[PDB]
Structure 1
Amino acid sequence: PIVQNLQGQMVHQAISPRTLNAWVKVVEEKAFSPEVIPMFSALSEGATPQDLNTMLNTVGGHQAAMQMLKETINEEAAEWDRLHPVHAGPIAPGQMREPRGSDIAGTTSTLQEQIGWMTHNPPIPVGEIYKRWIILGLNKIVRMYSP
C-alpha cells in the first residue's frame, strides 16, 4: 500500500503477512457472505491495484465466482476505456500519461507508475475506481450466490 511516512510524505510499504492471512481466513470462513464487502473495504485501505490483483490471485477455491469477477473487472475496464477516450496528440515531457482500464486493473501499469498517479498533484483515485468494480462484481456474486 501507499502510506504516509513520519517525515510527512506518501511512500509505498508492503502489506503485512497476518493482514494477508486475515484476508485468506475471511474468505475461508464467510465465503460469499455480505460481511466480506466492508471487511474487504477496511483491509483495502490505501491499497494499490497491484495489491488488489495479489489479493484476487491468492484466492483458492470458488473458481466459478473468481472467473465471474475477472470477467466483470474486464467489462468494467472496457467501459472505462469507452467512457474516457485517449487524449489529444502526443504525451507532454512535463507530464505523465493518462491511465486506461488495464492501468486501473494494474495490468499495464508498473508500481512506480501507480505511485506517480496517486501521489502526484492532483492525484487520481485508480484504487477507488477498481474498488467500485470489485464491490459491483461482489454484488453480482452475492446476488447469484443467494439460494
Structure 2
Amino acid sequence: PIVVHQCISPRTLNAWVKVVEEKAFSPEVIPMFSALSCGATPQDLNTMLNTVGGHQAAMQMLKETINEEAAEWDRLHPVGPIAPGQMREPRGSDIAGTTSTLQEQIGWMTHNPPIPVGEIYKRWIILGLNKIVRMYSPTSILDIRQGPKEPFRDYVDRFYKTLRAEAATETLLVQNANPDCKTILKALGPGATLEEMMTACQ
C-alpha cells in the first residue's frame, strides 16, 4: 500500500486468501476485498488477485471485465516521446499495473493532485467481482418462496440474500410469502415497514 510504499502485510495476505476459501463469491466478499485493499497500488491489487487459487473461470472472467474498462478508459482519456523527467499520463494498461512500474504507480497516486490509479483499478475489479457474484448466485429472487413451515424471518433473510446477489417488500416479498402470513400482511395497510411485517408474522 501507500501510507511511502509499505509491503502488503502477512495478515492482509492471509485474510484475503481465507475469505475467498471460506466464502467463494458470496456478496460480502466484495466489501472485504475493498477494505483489505485499502491504500492499495495496482501491483498490490494484482498481488491479491494472483494469490487466489482456484476459481480460475471467475478470475478469467474478471480479466475480460477489466479489459473492457481499460479500453473504455483509453477512449475517454487518450495519450510522441514524453517530456524528459516529467510524469506521463496513464493508459488503461498502466492503471491495471500491466505496463506500469511500481514507481510510476506511486508517482500518480501521490502526485499533487493525485491520479488515483489504485482506486480506479479497484473500481474496475469490483465491477468484475459483481458480475461474478451474480453468476455464482444460484437462485432468482422470483424463486424465493416462503416454505409452509419456514419462519418469516428466515424467508426474509433468503429473500434479501438472493436480492443482494443480483419497494421489494410491497411487491414480491408479500406475494411470495406463504398463505397464512400473506393474508396477515395483506391486512396491514399500504406503506407497512419491514419491522412491522416481521412482527406481524413472528
TM-score scaled by length of structure 2: 0.66
User: 1:51 offset after TM fit, Å?
Assistant: 0.6
Aligned partners of 2:84, 2:60: CA distance in 1, in Å? 39
- Structure 1 unpaired stretches of 5+: 4-10
Instruction: Tell me how many residue pairs correspond in the alignment.
Output: 138
User: 1:92 offset after TM fit, Å?
Assistant: 2.5
The secondary structure found in structure 1 opposite 2:11 is helix
- Counterpart of 1:13 in structure 2 is 6
Aligned partners of 1:14, 1:134: CA distance in 2, in Å? 21
User: 1:75 offset after TM fit, Å?
Assistant: 1.4
User: 1:34 offset after TM fit, Å?
Assistant: 0.7
Q: Deviations over 1:110-146 (max 9, x none)?
A: 0111111111111111111111111111111111111
User: 1:93 offset after TM fit, Å?
Assistant: 3.1
User: 1:69 offset after TM fit, Å?
Assistant: 0.3
Runs of 4+ in 1 over 6 A off after TM superposition: none
What is the aligned-residue identity percentage? 99
User: 1:94 offset after TM fit, Å?
Assistant: 5.6
Aligned partners of 2:58, 2:85: CA distance in 1, in Å? 43
Q: Deviations over 1:75-101 (max 9, x none)?
A: 111111111111xx5523362100000
The structure where strand makes up a greater share of residues is 1
Higher gyration radius (CA): 2
Which one has more relative contact order, counting CA pairs under 8 Å at least 6 apart? 1
Q: Deviations over 1:33-87 (max 9, x none)?
A: 111011011111100000101111111111110110011111111111111111x
Calculate the aligned-residue CA RMSD, in Å: 1.2
User: 1:107 offset after TM fit, Å?
Assistant: 0.8
TM-score scaled by length of structure 1: 0.89
